[PDB]
């Protein structure tokens, strides 16, 4: 009982974009107020906690195109 | 009892976009007020918690196109 | 008892869009007030909690096209 | 008792859109008031909770076209 | 007792739309008031809860066309 | 023709008040929205105008007693 | 023709008040939104104008008693 | 024609107040938003204008008693 | 025609107040946003203008008692 | 025609206050945002202008008692 397996995917996808002119942006946040209180903290695993923050972000790329691709093969007996 | 398996997907998808001119944007947030209170905290797994935040974000890409693709093959006996 | 399996999907889909001019946007939020209270917190799994937030977001892409695609094959005996 | 299986779907779908000019938008929210109270919190599974929020969002893409597609094949004995 | 199966769907669907000019929009919400109270909270499954919110959304795409498609084949013995 | 005038008012008025305990007060207003528009403004006198306001006041005195008294005498010929 | 005038008012008024304990007060206003527009402004007199304000006041005196008194005499010929 | 004038007012007024204990006060205002627009401004007199303000005041005296008194005499011929 | 004038007012007024203990006060303002626009400004008199301010005040005296008194005499011929 | 004038006011007013203990005060303001714009400025008189400010004041006296008094006499012919 022999087994033959072939795995030949093919991709030619393209992702493009065009933009002429870009700018003239203003971002003005006026302060804030935050307060937290806690007593016990215990994490034992793949944890990604984040406590008590005040953040301002300006993310302006000229491009901004993303592509994700995964393959997986599993054989058992 | 032999087994033959062929796996040959094909893709030629395209994702494009065009834009002439882009800008002239204003973003002005006026403050806030936040308060939290807790006693016990215990996570043991793939956790993604986030407690007590005040955030402002401006995300202005010129492109902004996304593409996700996954393949999976499993064989058992 | 032999088994023959062929898996040959084909795609040529396209996703495009055009836009001439884009801008002249205003966003002005005037504050707020938030308060939470809790005693016990215990998560042990793939959890995505989020407690006590005050957020402002401006998401203005020039493109903004999305495409999701998945394939899966399972064989058992 | 042999088995023959063929799987050959074909797609040529297209999704497009056009827009000349776009802008001149105003968004002005005037504050609020929120208060929550709880004692016990225990999640153990794929949970997506969200407690006590005050959010403002402006999502203005130039494109905005979406396409979802899934395939699945299962064989048992 | 052999079995022959053929699976060859074909699609050529198209989804388009046109729009000349678009804008001149105002959105002004004047505050609010919310209060919740609870004692016990226990979820163990694929849950999507959301408690105590005050939200404002402006979703103005230039395109806005959507397309969903699924295929499934199951074989048993 | 002589004139005699006597002006001898007498007052012994008293204004008192008692209060044992006082407190435990909450005041939580949730925002608003106001807009005015005008072109011409001309005042020439003892004017006390007030245009376009959003006010919150908490006036909690422990006493709060008031007393007004005026006298006037006029002689002509 | 002689004139005799006597002006002898007498006052013994008292204004008192008592209070045992006083406190435990909360004041939490959640934001707002105001906008005004005008073109011409001309005042020439004892004017007390006030345009375009957003105010919050907490006035908590321990006493708070007030007393006003005026006298006036006028003689003409 | 001689004139005799006597002006002998007498006052013994008292203004008091008592308070045992005083405190435990909270004041938390959450932001705001104000905008004004004008072109011409011309005042020529005793003017007390005030334009475009955002104020927060906490006025907590231990005493707080006030007393106003005026006298005036005028003679003409 | 001789004139005799006597001006002998007498005052013994007292203003007092007592307070045992005083404190435990909190004041937390969370930001703001202000914008003004004007073109012409011309004052020629006793003017007390004030334009475009953002102020926070905490005025906590232990005493706080006030007393105003004026006298005036005018003679003409 | 001789004239006799006597001006003998008498005052014995007292202003006192007592306070046992005083303190434990917090003052925490969280930022702000201010912007002004003007073109012409011309004052020629006793003017007291004040433009474009952001101020924080803590005025905590142990005493705080005030007393104002004026006298005036005018003679004409």
mmCIF file with all atom_site columns, N, CA and C in Angstrom, chain D residues 4 6 8 10 14 20-21 23-24 26-28 30 33 35 37 40 42 45-46 50 52 55-57 59 61 63-66 68 70 74, chain E residues 3 5 7 9 11 13 15 17 20 22-25 27 29 34 36 38-39 41 45 51 56 58-60 62-65 67 71 73 75:
data_model
loop_
_atom_site.group_PDB
_atom_site.id
_atom_site.type_symbol
_atom_site.label_atom_id
_atom_site.label_alt_id
_atom_site.label_comp_id
_atom_site.label_asym_id
_atom_site.label_entity_id
_atom_site.label_seq_id
_atom_site.pdbx_PDB_ins_code
_atom_site.Cartn_x
_atom_site.Cartn_y
_atom_site.Cartn_z
_atom_site.occupancy
_atom_site.B_iso_or_equiv
_atom_site.pdbx_formal_charge
_atom_site.auth_seq_id
_atom_site.auth_comp_id
_atom_site.auth_asym_id
_atom_site.auth_atom_id
_atom_site.pdbx_PDB_model_num
ATOM 1   N N  . UNK D 1 4  ? -13.377 7.991  -7.776  1.00 0.00 ? 4  UNK D N  1
ATOM 2   C CA . UNK D 1 4  ? -12.802 9.085  -8.542  1.00 0.00 ? 4  UNK D CA 1
ATOM 3   C C  . UNK D 1 4  ? -13.537 10.369 -8.194  1.00 0.00 ? 4  UNK D C  1
ATOM 4   N N  . UNK D 1 6  ? -13.393 14.725 -8.778  1.00 0.00 ? 6  UNK D N  1
ATOM 5   C CA . UNK D 1 6  ? -12.852 15.880 -9.484  1.00 0.00 ? 6  UNK D CA 1
ATOM 6   C C  . UNK D 1 6  ? -13.463 17.128 -8.865  1.00 0.00 ? 6  UNK D C  1
ATOM 7   N N  . UNK D 1 8  ? -13.150 21.104 -9.665  1.00 0.00 ? 8  UNK D N  1
ATOM 8   C CA . UNK D 1 8  ? -12.627 22.157 -10.535 1.00 0.00 ? 8  UNK D CA 1
ATOM 9   C C  . UNK D 1 8  ? -13.608 23.315 -10.667 1.00 0.00 ? 8  UNK D C  1
ATOM 10  N N  . UNK D 1 10 ? -14.487 27.315 -11.085 1.00 0.00 ? 10 UNK D N  1
ATOM 11  C CA . UNK D 1 10 ? -13.881 28.410 -11.831 1.00 0.00 ? 10 UNK D CA 1
ATOM 12  C C  . UNK D 1 10 ? -14.631 29.690 -11.510 1.00 0.00 ? 10 UNK D C  1
ATOM 13  N N  . UNK D 1 14 ? -15.871 40.043 -10.827 1.00 0.00 ? 14 UNK D N  1
ATOM 14  C CA . UNK D 1 14 ? -15.215 41.334 -10.697 1.00 0.00 ? 14 UNK D CA 1
ATOM 15  C C  . UNK D 1 14 ? -16.073 42.252 -9.838  1.00 0.00 ? 14 UNK D C  1
ATOM 16  N N  . UNK D 1 20 ? -16.471 60.360 -8.115  1.00 0.00 ? 20 UNK D N  1
ATOM 17  C CA . UNK D 1 20 ? -15.773 61.532 -8.613  1.00 0.00 ? 20 UNK D CA 1
ATOM 18  C C  . UNK D 1 20 ? -15.070 62.309 -7.518  1.00 0.00 ? 20 UNK D C  1
ATOM 19  N N  . UNK D 1 21 ? -15.838 62.908 -6.615  1.00 0.00 ? 21 UNK D N  1
ATOM 20  C CA . UNK D 1 21 ? -15.270 63.765 -5.586  1.00 0.00 ? 21 UNK D CA 1
ATOM 21  C C  . UNK D 1 21 ? -15.958 63.454 -4.270  1.00 0.00 ? 21 UNK D C  1
ATOM 22  N N  . UNK D 1 23 ? -15.833 64.466 0.106   1.00 0.00 ? 23 UNK D N  1
ATOM 23  C CA . UNK D 1 23 ? -15.287 65.222 1.212   1.00 0.00 ? 23 UNK D CA 1
ATOM 24  C C  . UNK D 1 23 ? -16.355 66.042 1.898   1.00 0.00 ? 23 UNK D C  1
ATOM 25  N N  . UNK D 1 24 ? -15.889 67.101 2.559   1.00 0.00 ? 24 UNK D N  1
ATOM 26  C CA . UNK D 1 24 ? -16.769 68.062 3.210   1.00 0.00 ? 24 UNK D CA 1
ATOM 27  C C  . UNK D 1 24 ? -17.659 67.383 4.240   1.00 0.00 ? 24 UNK D C  1
ATOM 28  N N  . UNK D 1 26 ? -18.387 66.640 8.566   1.00 0.00 ? 26 UNK D N  1
ATOM 29  C CA . UNK D 1 26 ? -18.194 67.146 9.916   1.00 0.00 ? 26 UNK D CA 1
ATOM 30  C C  . UNK D 1 26 ? -18.732 66.132 10.906  1.00 0.00 ? 26 UNK D C  1
ATOM 31  N N  . UNK D 1 27 ? -18.064 66.011 12.047  1.00 0.00 ? 27 UNK D N  1
ATOM 32  C CA . UNK D 1 27 ? -18.408 65.034 13.075  1.00 0.00 ? 27 UNK D CA 1
ATOM 33  C C  . UNK D 1 27 ? -18.069 65.641 14.426  1.00 0.00 ? 27 UNK D C  1
ATOM 34  N N  . UNK D 1 28 ? -19.089 65.968 15.214  1.00 0.00 ? 28 UNK D N  1
ATOM 35  C CA . UNK D 1 28 ? -18.911 66.692 16.471  1.00 0.00 ? 28 UNK D CA 1
ATOM 36  C C  . UNK D 1 28 ? -19.801 66.100 17.556  1.00 0.00 ? 28 UNK D C  1
ATOM 37  N N  . UNK D 1 30 ? -20.826 65.637 21.480  1.00 0.00 ? 30 UNK D N  1
ATOM 38  C CA . UNK D 1 30 ? -20.710 66.386 22.718  1.00 0.00 ? 30 UNK D CA 1
ATOM 39  C C  . UNK D 1 30 ? -20.729 65.643 24.041  1.00 0.00 ? 30 UNK D C  1
ATOM 40  N N  . UNK D 1 33 ? -21.734 60.143 29.574  1.00 0.00 ? 33 UNK D N  1
ATOM 41  C CA . UNK D 1 33 ? -21.648 59.725 30.968  1.00 0.00 ? 33 UNK D CA 1
ATOM 42  C C  . UNK D 1 33 ? -21.972 58.241 31.068  1.00 0.00 ? 33 UNK D C  1
ATOM 43  N N  . UNK D 1 35 ? -21.410 54.526 33.668  1.00 0.00 ? 35 UNK D N  1
ATOM 44  C CA . UNK D 1 35 ? -21.010 53.933 34.940  1.00 0.00 ? 35 UNK D CA 1
ATOM 45  C C  . UNK D 1 35 ? -21.476 52.487 35.016  1.00 0.00 ? 35 UNK D C  1
ATOM 46  N N  . UNK D 1 37 ? -20.969 48.512 37.272  1.00 0.00 ? 37 UNK D N  1
ATOM 47  C CA . UNK D 1 37 ? -20.640 47.910 38.557  1.00 0.00 ? 37 UNK D CA 1
ATOM 48  C C  . UNK D 1 37 ? -20.848 46.405 38.496  1.00 0.00 ? 37 UNK D C  1
ATOM 49  N N  . UNK D 1 40 ? -18.095 39.633 40.062  1.00 0.00 ? 40 UNK D N  1
ATOM 50  C CA . UNK D 1 40 ? -17.396 38.411 39.696  1.00 0.00 ? 40 UNK D CA 1
ATOM 51  C C  . UNK D 1 40 ? -17.287 38.312 38.182  1.00 0.00 ? 40 UNK D C  1
ATOM 52  N N  . UNK D 1 42 ? -15.541 35.591 35.258  1.00 0.00 ? 42 UNK D N  1
ATOM 53  C CA . UNK D 1 42 ? -14.850 34.338 34.975  1.00 0.00 ? 42 UNK D CA 1
ATOM 54  C C  . UNK D 1 42 ? -15.212 33.878 33.570  1.00 0.00 ? 42 UNK D C  1
ATOM 55  N N  . UNK D 1 45 ? -13.151 30.425 27.733  1.00 0.00 ? 45 UNK D N  1
ATOM 56  C CA . UNK D 1 45 ? -13.277 29.938 26.364  1.00 0.00 ? 45 UNK D CA 1
ATOM 57  C C  . UNK D 1 45 ? -12.882 31.037 25.392  1.00 0.00 ? 45 UNK D C  1
ATOM 58  N N  . UNK D 1 46 ? -13.162 30.832 24.108  1.00 0.00 ? 46 UNK D N  1
ATOM 59  C CA . UNK D 1 46 ? -12.964 31.869 23.101  1.00 0.00 ? 46 UNK D CA 1
ATOM 60  C C  . UNK D 1 46 ? -14.026 32.945 23.310  1.00 0.00 ? 46 UNK D C  1
ATOM 61  N N  . UNK D 1 50 ? -16.323 42.993 26.213  1.00 0.00 ? 50 UNK D N  1
ATOM 62  C CA . UNK D 1 50 ? -15.990 44.414 26.123  1.00 0.00 ? 50 UNK D CA 1
ATOM 63  C C  . UNK D 1 50 ? -16.936 45.167 27.049  1.00 0.00 ? 50 UNK D C  1
ATOM 64  N N  . UNK D 1 52 ? -17.889 48.644 29.428  1.00 0.00 ? 52 UNK D N  1
ATOM 65  C CA . UNK D 1 52 ? -17.703 50.022 29.833  1.00 0.00 ? 52 UNK D CA 1
ATOM 66  C C  . UNK D 1 52 ? -16.876 50.858 28.880  1.00 0.00 ? 52 UNK D C  1
ATOM 67  N N  . UNK D 1 55 ? -16.906 55.388 22.706  1.00 0.00 ? 55 UNK D N  1
ATOM 68  C CA . UNK D 1 55 ? -16.126 55.347 21.479  1.00 0.00 ? 55 UNK D CA 1
ATOM 69  C C  . UNK D 1 55 ? -16.699 56.283 20.425  1.00 0.00 ? 55 UNK D C  1
ATOM 70  N N  . UNK D 1 56 ? -15.809 56.843 19.612  1.00 0.00 ? 56 UNK D N  1
ATOM 71  C CA . UNK D 1 56 ? -16.185 57.645 18.459  1.00 0.00 ? 56 UNK D CA 1
ATOM 72  C C  . UNK D 1 56 ? -15.317 57.227 17.287  1.00 0.00 ? 56 UNK D C  1
ATOM 73  N N  . UNK D 1 57 ? -15.944 56.930 16.153  1.00 0.00 ? 57 UNK D N  1
ATOM 74  C CA . UNK D 1 57 ? -15.248 56.375 15.000  1.00 0.00 ? 57 UNK D CA 1
ATOM 75  C C  . UNK D 1 57 ? -15.664 57.122 13.745  1.00 0.00 ? 57 UNK D C  1
ATOM 76  N N  . UNK D 1 59 ? -14.897 56.361 9.779   1.00 0.00 ? 59 UNK D N  1
ATOM 77  C CA . UNK D 1 59 ? -14.310 55.383 8.869   1.00 0.00 ? 59 UNK D CA 1
ATOM 78  C C  . UNK D 1 59 ? -14.712 55.759 7.453   1.00 0.00 ? 59 UNK D C  1
ATOM 79  N N  . UNK D 1 61 ? -13.351 55.312 3.832   1.00 0.00 ? 61 UNK D N  1
ATOM 80  C CA . UNK D 1 61 ? -12.452 54.838 2.784   1.00 0.00 ? 61 UNK D CA 1
ATOM 81  C C  . UNK D 1 61 ? -12.843 55.383 1.423   1.00 0.00 ? 61 UNK D C  1
ATOM 82  N N  . UNK D 1 63 ? -12.255 53.423 -1.280  1.00 0.00 ? 63 UNK D N  1
ATOM 83  C CA . UNK D 1 63 ? -12.737 52.242 -1.964  1.00 0.00 ? 63 UNK D CA 1
ATOM 84  C C  . UNK D 1 63 ? -13.834 51.569 -1.176  1.00 0.00 ? 63 UNK D C  1
ATOM 85  N N  . UNK D 1 64 ? -13.497 50.508 -0.453  1.00 0.00 ? 64 UNK D N  1
ATOM 86  C CA . UNK D 1 64 ? -14.449 49.879 0.437   1.00 0.00 ? 64 UNK D CA 1
ATOM 87  C C  . UNK D 1 64 ? -15.160 48.670 -0.116  1.00 0.00 ? 64 UNK D C  1
ATOM 88  N N  . UNK D 1 65 ? -14.495 47.858 -0.926  1.00 0.00 ? 65 UNK D N  1
ATOM 89  C CA . UNK D 1 65 ? -15.119 46.673 -1.490  1.00 0.00 ? 65 UNK D CA 1
ATOM 90  C C  . UNK D 1 65 ? -14.513 45.429 -0.861  1.00 0.00 ? 65 UNK D C  1
ATOM 91  N N  . UNK D 1 66 ? -15.358 44.439 -0.604  1.00 0.00 ? 66 UNK D N  1
ATOM 92  C CA . UNK D 1 66 ? -15.000 43.279 0.194   1.00 0.00 ? 66 UNK D CA 1
ATOM 93  C C  . UNK D 1 66 ? -15.418 42.020 -0.544  1.00 0.00 ? 66 UNK D C  1
ATOM 94  N N  . UNK D 1 68 ? -15.372 37.578 0.163   1.00 0.00 ? 68 UNK D N  1
ATOM 95  C CA . UNK D 1 68 ? -15.064 36.438 1.013   1.00 0.00 ? 68 UNK D CA 1
ATOM 96  C C  . UNK D 1 68 ? -15.385 35.169 0.240   1.00 0.00 ? 68 UNK D C  1
ATOM 97  N N  . UNK D 1 70 ? -14.735 30.680 0.621   1.00 0.00 ? 70 UNK D N  1
ATOM 98  C CA . UNK D 1 70 ? -14.197 29.537 1.348   1.00 0.00 ? 70 UNK D CA 1
ATOM 99  C C  . UNK D 1 70 ? -14.495 28.259 0.584   1.00 0.00 ? 70 UNK D C  1
ATOM 100 N N  . UNK D 1 74 ? -14.195 17.181 2.757   1.00 0.00 ? 74 UNK D N  1
ATOM 101 C CA . UNK D 1 74 ? -13.986 16.217 3.827   1.00 0.00 ? 74 UNK D CA 1
ATOM 102 C C  . UNK D 1 74 ? -14.268 14.814 3.310   1.00 0.00 ? 74 UNK D C  1
ATOM 103 N N  . UNK E 2 3  ? -17.551 4.842  -7.978  1.00 0.00 ? 3  UNK E N  1
ATOM 104 C CA . UNK E 2 3  ? -18.280 6.097  -7.858  1.00 0.00 ? 3  UNK E CA 1
ATOM 105 C C  . UNK E 2 3  ? -17.514 7.180  -8.600  1.00 0.00 ? 3  UNK E C  1
ATOM 106 N N  . UNK E 2 5  ? -17.639 11.372 -9.455  1.00 0.00 ? 5  UNK E N  1
ATOM 107 C CA . UNK E 2 5  ? -18.206 12.641 -9.012  1.00 0.00 ? 5  UNK E CA 1
ATOM 108 C C  . UNK E 2 5  ? -17.489 13.780 -9.718  1.00 0.00 ? 5  UNK E C  1
ATOM 109 N N  . UNK E 2 7  ? -17.511 18.123 -10.130 1.00 0.00 ? 7  UNK E N  1
ATOM 110 C CA . UNK E 2 7  ? -17.894 19.325 -9.391  1.00 0.00 ? 7  UNK E CA 1
ATOM 111 C C  . UNK E 2 7  ? -17.289 20.517 -10.125 1.00 0.00 ? 7  UNK E C  1
ATOM 112 N N  . UNK E 2 9  ? -18.694 24.071 -10.956 1.00 0.00 ? 9  UNK E N  1
ATOM 113 C CA . UNK E 2 9  ? -19.472 25.306 -11.062 1.00 0.00 ? 9  UNK E CA 1
ATOM 114 C C  . UNK E 2 9  ? -18.666 26.405 -11.733 1.00 0.00 ? 9  UNK E C  1
ATOM 115 N N  . UNK E 2 11 ? -18.794 30.786 -12.527 1.00 0.00 ? 11 UNK E N  1
ATOM 116 C CA . UNK E 2 11 ? -19.372 32.075 -12.177 1.00 0.00 ? 11 UNK E CA 1
ATOM 117 C C  . UNK E 2 11 ? -18.715 33.174 -12.994 1.00 0.00 ? 11 UNK E C  1
ATOM 118 N N  . UNK E 2 13 ? -20.216 36.536 -12.360 1.00 0.00 ? 13 UNK E N  1
ATOM 119 C CA . UNK E 2 13 ? -20.999 37.636 -11.827 1.00 0.00 ? 13 UNK E CA 1
ATOM 120 C C  . UNK E 2 13 ? -20.147 38.895 -11.692 1.00 0.00 ? 13 UNK E C  1
ATOM 121 N N  . UNK E 2 15 ? -20.333 43.044 -10.031 1.00 0.00 ? 15 UNK E N  1
ATOM 122 C CA . UNK E 2 15 ? -21.015 43.967 -9.132  1.00 0.00 ? 15 UNK E CA 1
ATOM 123 C C  . UNK E 2 15 ? -20.331 45.324 -9.218  1.00 0.00 ? 15 UNK E C  1
ATOM 124 N N  . UNK E 2 17 ? -20.955 49.935 -9.502  1.00 0.00 ? 17 UNK E N  1
ATOM 125 C CA . UNK E 2 17 ? -21.765 51.072 -9.092  1.00 0.00 ? 17 UNK E CA 1
ATOM 126 C C  . UNK E 2 17 ? -21.002 52.350 -9.397  1.00 0.00 ? 17 UNK E C  1
ATOM 127 N N  . UNK E 2 20 ? -21.430 60.302 -8.786  1.00 0.00 ? 20 UNK E N  1
ATOM 128 C CA . UNK E 2 20 ? -20.736 61.485 -9.266  1.00 0.00 ? 20 UNK E CA 1
ATOM 129 C C  . UNK E 2 20 ? -20.032 62.244 -8.158  1.00 0.00 ? 20 UNK E C  1
ATOM 130 N N  . UNK E 2 22 ? -20.187 63.495 -3.787  1.00 0.00 ? 22 UNK E N  1
ATOM 131 C CA . UNK E 2 22 ? -20.617 62.930 -2.514  1.00 0.00 ? 22 UNK E CA 1
ATOM 132 C C  . UNK E 2 22 ? -19.969 63.723 -1.393  1.00 0.00 ? 22 UNK E C  1
ATOM 133 N N  . UNK E 2 23 ? -20.779 64.258 -0.492  1.00 0.00 ? 23 UNK E N  1
ATOM 134 C CA . UNK E 2 23 ? -20.231 64.994 0.626   1.00 0.00 ? 23 UNK E CA 1
ATOM 135 C C  . UNK E 2 23 ? -21.299 65.800 1.329   1.00 0.00 ? 23 UNK E C  1
ATOM 136 N N  . UNK E 2 24 ? -20.834 66.846 2.008   1.00 0.00 ? 24 UNK E N  1
ATOM 137 C CA . UNK E 2 24 ? -21.714 67.793 2.680   1.00 0.00 ? 24 UNK E CA 1
ATOM 138 C C  . UNK E 2 24 ? -22.600 67.094 3.698   1.00 0.00 ? 24 UNK E C  1
ATOM 139 N N  . UNK E 2 25 ? -21.993 66.524 4.734   1.00 0.00 ? 25 UNK E N  1
ATOM 140 C CA . UNK E 2 25 ? -22.694 65.728 5.733   1.00 0.00 ? 25 UNK E CA 1
ATOM 141 C C  . UNK E 2 25 ? -22.337 66.258 7.112   1.00 0.00 ? 25 UNK E C  1
ATOM 142 N N  . UNK E 2 27 ? -22.981 65.577 11.481  1.00 0.00 ? 27 UNK E N  1
ATOM 143 C CA . UNK E 2 27 ? -23.320 64.580 12.491  1.00 0.00 ? 27 UNK E CA 1
ATOM 144 C C  . UNK E 2 27 ? -22.978 65.163 13.853  1.00 0.00 ? 27 UNK E C  1
ATOM 145 N N  . UNK E 2 29 ? -24.177 64.610 17.755  1.00 0.00 ? 29 UNK E N  1
ATOM 146 C CA . UNK E 2 29 ? -24.953 64.029 18.851  1.00 0.00 ? 29 UNK E CA 1
ATOM 147 C C  . UNK E 2 29 ? -24.651 64.703 20.179  1.00 0.00 ? 29 UNK E C  1
ATOM 148 N N  . UNK E 2 34 ? -25.919 56.659 30.952  1.00 0.00 ? 34 UNK E N  1
ATOM 149 C CA . UNK E 2 34 ? -26.047 55.206 31.003  1.00 0.00 ? 34 UNK E CA 1
ATOM 150 C C  . UNK E 2 34 ? -25.563 54.701 32.356  1.00 0.00 ? 34 UNK E C  1
ATOM 151 N N  . UNK E 2 36 ? -25.392 50.715 34.573  1.00 0.00 ? 36 UNK E N  1
ATOM 152 C CA . UNK E 2 36 ? -25.664 49.284 34.636  1.00 0.00 ? 36 UNK E CA 1
ATOM 153 C C  . UNK E 2 36 ? -25.235 48.762 35.999  1.00 0.00 ? 36 UNK E C  1
ATOM 154 N N  . UNK E 2 38 ? -24.645 44.717 37.990  1.00 0.00 ? 38 UNK E N  1
ATOM 155 C CA . UNK E 2 38 ? -24.710 43.264 37.922  1.00 0.00 ? 38 UNK E CA 1
ATOM 156 C C  . UNK E 2 38 ? -23.790 42.673 38.977  1.00 0.00 ? 38 UNK E C  1
ATOM 157 N N  . UNK E 2 39 ? -23.964 41.381 39.239  1.00 0.00 ? 39 UNK E N  1
ATOM 158 C CA . UNK E 2 39 ? -23.220 40.727 40.309  1.00 0.00 ? 39 UNK E CA 1
ATOM 159 C C  . UNK E 2 39 ? -22.357 39.566 39.846  1.00 0.00 ? 39 UNK E C  1
ATOM 160 N N  . UNK E 2 41 ? -20.914 36.969 36.605  1.00 0.00 ? 41 UNK E N  1
ATOM 161 C CA . UNK E 2 41 ? -20.674 36.905 35.165  1.00 0.00 ? 41 UNK E CA 1
ATOM 162 C C  . UNK E 2 41 ? -19.801 35.684 34.894  1.00 0.00 ? 41 UNK E C  1
ATOM 163 N N  . UNK E 2 45 ? -17.949 29.719 26.493  1.00 0.00 ? 45 UNK E N  1
ATOM 164 C CA . UNK E 2 45 ? -18.079 29.256 25.116  1.00 0.00 ? 45 UNK E CA 1
ATOM 165 C C  . UNK E 2 45 ? -17.688 30.374 24.163  1.00 0.00 ? 45 UNK E C  1
ATOM 166 N N  . UNK E 2 51 ? -21.224 45.074 27.140  1.00 0.00 ? 51 UNK E N  1
ATOM 167 C CA . UNK E 2 51 ? -22.020 45.591 28.246  1.00 0.00 ? 51 UNK E CA 1
ATOM 168 C C  . UNK E 2 51 ? -21.689 47.057 28.469  1.00 0.00 ? 51 UNK E C  1
ATOM 169 N N  . UNK E 2 56 ? -20.685 56.277 18.869  1.00 0.00 ? 56 UNK E N  1
ATOM 170 C CA . UNK E 2 56 ? -21.067 57.099 17.733  1.00 0.00 ? 56 UNK E CA 1
ATOM 171 C C  . UNK E 2 56 ? -20.201 56.704 16.550  1.00 0.00 ? 56 UNK E C  1
ATOM 172 N N  . UNK E 2 58 ? -19.586 56.986 12.161  1.00 0.00 ? 58 UNK E N  1
ATOM 173 C CA . UNK E 2 58 ? -19.840 57.567 10.849  1.00 0.00 ? 58 UNK E CA 1
ATOM 174 C C  . UNK E 2 58 ? -19.075 56.748 9.826   1.00 0.00 ? 58 UNK E C  1
ATOM 175 N N  . UNK E 2 59 ? -19.799 55.977 9.026   1.00 0.00 ? 59 UNK E N  1
ATOM 176 C CA . UNK E 2 59 ? -19.213 55.019 8.098   1.00 0.00 ? 59 UNK E CA 1
ATOM 177 C C  . UNK E 2 59 ? -19.620 55.418 6.689   1.00 0.00 ? 59 UNK E C  1
ATOM 178 N N  . UNK E 2 60 ? -18.737 56.121 5.992   1.00 0.00 ? 60 UNK E N  1
ATOM 179 C CA . UNK E 2 60 ? -19.073 56.684 4.688   1.00 0.00 ? 60 UNK E CA 1
ATOM 180 C C  . UNK E 2 60 ? -18.066 56.206 3.654   1.00 0.00 ? 60 UNK E C  1
ATOM 181 N N  . UNK E 2 62 ? -16.770 55.258 -0.232  1.00 0.00 ? 62 UNK E N  1
ATOM 182 C CA . UNK E 2 62 ? -17.050 55.627 -1.607  1.00 0.00 ? 62 UNK E CA 1
ATOM 183 C C  . UNK E 2 62 ? -17.571 54.472 -2.435  1.00 0.00 ? 62 UNK E C  1
ATOM 184 N N  . UNK E 2 63 ? -17.182 53.249 -2.093  1.00 0.00 ? 63 UNK E N  1
ATOM 185 C CA . UNK E 2 63 ? -17.662 52.081 -2.797  1.00 0.00 ? 63 UNK E CA 1
ATOM 186 C C  . UNK E 2 63 ? -18.756 51.391 -2.018  1.00 0.00 ? 63 UNK E C  1
ATOM 187 N N  . UNK E 2 64 ? -18.415 50.318 -1.316  1.00 0.00 ? 64 UNK E N  1
ATOM 188 C CA . UNK E 2 64 ? -19.363 49.670 -0.436  1.00 0.00 ? 64 UNK E CA 1
ATOM 189 C C  . UNK E 2 64 ? -20.073 48.469 -1.008  1.00 0.00 ? 64 UNK E C  1
ATOM 190 N N  . UNK E 2 65 ? -19.409 47.675 -1.834  1.00 0.00 ? 65 UNK E N  1
ATOM 191 C CA . UNK E 2 65 ? -20.031 46.499 -2.419  1.00 0.00 ? 65 UNK E CA 1
ATOM 192 C C  . UNK E 2 65 ? -19.421 45.244 -1.816  1.00 0.00 ? 65 UNK E C  1
ATOM 193 N N  . UNK E 2 67 ? -19.558 40.742 -1.388  1.00 0.00 ? 67 UNK E N  1
ATOM 194 C CA . UNK E 2 67 ? -19.853 39.471 -2.097  1.00 0.00 ? 67 UNK E CA 1
ATOM 195 C C  . UNK E 2 67 ? -19.370 38.296 -1.258  1.00 0.00 ? 67 UNK E C  1
ATOM 196 N N  . UNK E 2 71 ? -18.454 27.086 -0.614  1.00 0.00 ? 71 UNK E N  1
ATOM 197 C CA . UNK E 2 71 ? -18.649 25.766 -1.193  1.00 0.00 ? 71 UNK E CA 1
ATOM 198 C C  . UNK E 2 71 ? -18.300 24.717 -0.153  1.00 0.00 ? 71 UNK E C  1
ATOM 199 N N  . UNK E 2 73 ? -18.246 20.176 0.312   1.00 0.00 ? 73 UNK E N  1
ATOM 200 C CA . UNK E 2 73 ? -18.499 18.816 -0.151  1.00 0.00 ? 73 UNK E CA 1
ATOM 201 C C  . UNK E 2 73 ? -18.139 17.866 0.976   1.00 0.00 ? 73 UNK E C  1
ATOM 202 N N  . UNK E 2 75 ? -18.209 13.619 2.087   1.00 0.00 ? 75 UNK E N  1
ATOM 203 C CA . UNK E 2 75 ? -18.368 12.228 1.690   1.00 0.00 ? 75 UNK E CA 1
ATOM 204 C C  . UNK E 2 75 ? -18.259 11.344 2.920   1.00 0.00 ? 75 UNK E C  1
#
